[model samples]
Target: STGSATTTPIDSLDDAYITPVQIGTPAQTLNLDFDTGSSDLWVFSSETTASEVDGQTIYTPSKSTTAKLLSGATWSISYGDGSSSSGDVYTDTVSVGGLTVTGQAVESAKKVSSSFTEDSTIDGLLGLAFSTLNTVSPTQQKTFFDNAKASLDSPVFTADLGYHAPGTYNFGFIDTTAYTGSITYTAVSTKQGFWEWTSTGYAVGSGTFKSTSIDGIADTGTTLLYLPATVVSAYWAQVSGAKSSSSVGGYVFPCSATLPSFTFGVGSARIVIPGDYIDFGPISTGSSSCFGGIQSSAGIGINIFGDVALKAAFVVFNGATTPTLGFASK
Candidate 1:
């Protein structure tokens, strides 16, 4: 974080982000993405050259008064996804909220992909998906959870996303500021980053179409929320000129139109997908052609709710204090 490095700070080739979790006995601050697409908690460092990391935030171990680099070794990694980076293992004082840990086996990445280079503030991605996609030479390595369980007051972690900005990505919390009261938890079947589950059903129009059919998983690692073609047509029926075709693939609509919102029930908790997400103009599908929340993975089996869906409902994934997820309403 080399083609993925126990020696150079390279790309893990693995995809996904981890939610920021507290590390170290004294408490060190680690911002990670709670990625369900891939697993691992990797960061960045100042050791990276300017050219290698054109637009990433370099974590200067020297600058942080509390950060301590593990002298045993340093590493680098690269991947075909156009992601790469380098760094070292370090023991640092880390903390989150009121909890803390010590001697965390944290991986620091220096070099990074051009996509990461886009945001001056995006330093590195924490793989919070699963051990299967570790991509490192050694497989089955637990990035965050496996390490924290040993010392955490409770062998629990959670993530809560907050809608601070239009696209503000938030993680690591038992509850989001949006939804409050008692906790509603769901049991997840751990595999890769994709925590698979039966959709039980789906809804369209403003309750115009409610069916116990659609089935799939909600993935934060994916950038788009893919669905089936019929579902797409039904969803478009509620939008303005949603049937219109544009440069983008899927159902293209006027950006000005208020996109419709839909809800999916996971266990007892109802996860909401906002209109902004459903009306994705481009970035995801080619033009703004109303993409399916269930796209064709070609039976590589499709259907996933990516970041766009999460952004709609401020959600969180806790791996530090507890390994649970909660949602905050808009």
Candidate 2:
């Protein structure tokens, strides 16, 4: 049998989605961000420092009847954005939607960065990336999806993200009604622990397409789309009055700028991102300045097809045999 769950944006951030997940015996519920970039099912727990527990729900292992500690096990991870968390490991029951997995390794956070502490609502993250990326020391642990895949009807999952609204995430099964048109399949290279794929080329607006290939990752946890510096410069060149601002950290332009749609080639499918979506939002209050959704992937090296790009289509992260990505217009 298959299972699915609803994911909702928190505070119209458009940066990430939160889904309800139950952990441990007797089921302690938590709202976790399902991330495809990293693998480590961790939560803010009782071991976290008091000052670091700002409004986040903490998981108490002692309260769970079935929780067991993995002797000498530890975990630590830091993201490109500098946000990080680390702690000891515990084996517990984990359930997502209607599917349940026994003996799932749950990393309990004893330390967290300021980025996570300030954002109080998010309880944790459910990593959907390959189990090879799991951070547990002494021995690596399996992700919830990895542990449950053997029992699923199909080894597949779909990410139906919405723009400033709630969407659905389906596991083990795909809903035909959720998307329109034929699905475009692209082979994924998971050497980097990401759903990494290469784009044939891209075009800024209705102009001619550039054949320059771009290698990148489809990251649901990221808010903005990041591209090569040259690609970013070329895109902004089309917009009048657009300039890279050091203070703004990206390209910014007048709110009234007539931006064109950005399109990228994925196999035979040419996915076009609307102009309005690229406008992001105003940079300052009561001002005409606004930031562009697409920015330079300078320090990060590889481009990131973040929520800005993913929300524009229905994405299928196929875990069967060789990992492949299926994209369809929503």
Candidate 3:
């Protein structure tokens, strides 16, 4: 079976892709951020502190006829950005993008913090990473894609994120009309429960391609692209007035400065990130300094090809036991 869903960005920055999800017997609907960076299908639930709901939707298990508690199952997850949540477990009918799965493990949030409750834009997160990264303990569970992959015509899902527009997430099949040119395939290291791959090399703007492999994960949950300090420094160096700001927490430059396009390799193909996409807007409303869409991974510890880079191309996450990643121009 195959399904296609629209993922709309919650903000102008295209920070996260929130897909509408249908769960429970009555089909309670929730808009969830589908994150390939982590593995946990958790949600704001009736068990969450009432005040913390903060205008967000809650998944009430009591309202679902098929809801069943997974005894002794609990979960706690802390993210690279310090956001975290802990919850109990329940299994119920869940569906996304028209694909349905029965008795799917759903983590019901009891405690949440660090941006989960800031707005009604996102009720929870749907993790697309491997089940090996699932936070549920005692007995780990499969991700939504993992459970549905068996029935899919192909063991893969694709993400086509656009700059300032809704994107597509298709399961079981790739949409030929969504991308152009050939799709470059590369081996993925699933050891970290992420779609981690080694980049063949990089080029700063029209500069010569530097043949240096960099290993990084493709994370849809992150808003910016992060790379080795040297690469970041080189790119920013091309822009006048750009500086890695310690006070502002990353690189920032005069909002009026022209940014150079960045190109990175996939096997032999190189995808280019337009200069305009690197202009992440002003750090403050009326401020002259603008934050860069690309930053150094020195602080994060792992290089990340986040939305800043993913939005510039079409991305495919193959969920086969031996997973692989595909990239293409759009």
Q: How far out, in Å, is residue 145 in model 3?
A: 0.8
lDDT tens digits by residue: candidate 2, 57-138: 8889999999999989999999889789999999999988888888999999999999988887799999998889999997
lDDT of 1 by residue, 195-293 (tens): 544554567535843546555555665655666666656677776665533454344665557766777655555656766545434434354433433
Per-candidate TM equals 0.66, 0.96, 0.98
Worst 10 residues of 2 by lDDT: 9-18
Better of 2 and 3 by TM-score: 3
Point out the higher-scoring one by TM-score: 1 or 3: 3
**Per-residue error at 144 for model 3, in Å?**
0.5
lDDT of each: 0.49, 0.89, 0.91
A best-first ranking of the candidates according to their TM-score comes to 3, 2, 1
**Residue 190 alpha-carbon offset, candidate 1, angstroms:** 1.4
- lDDT of candidate 3 over 141-230, digit per residue (tens): 998988898789999999998899998889999888888999999999988888899999999989999999899999998889999999
Q: What is the lDDT of candidate 2?
A: 0.89
User: Which residue ranges in model 2 land beyond 4 Å of their true spot?
Assistant: none
Which regions of candidate 3 are displaced past 4 Å?
none
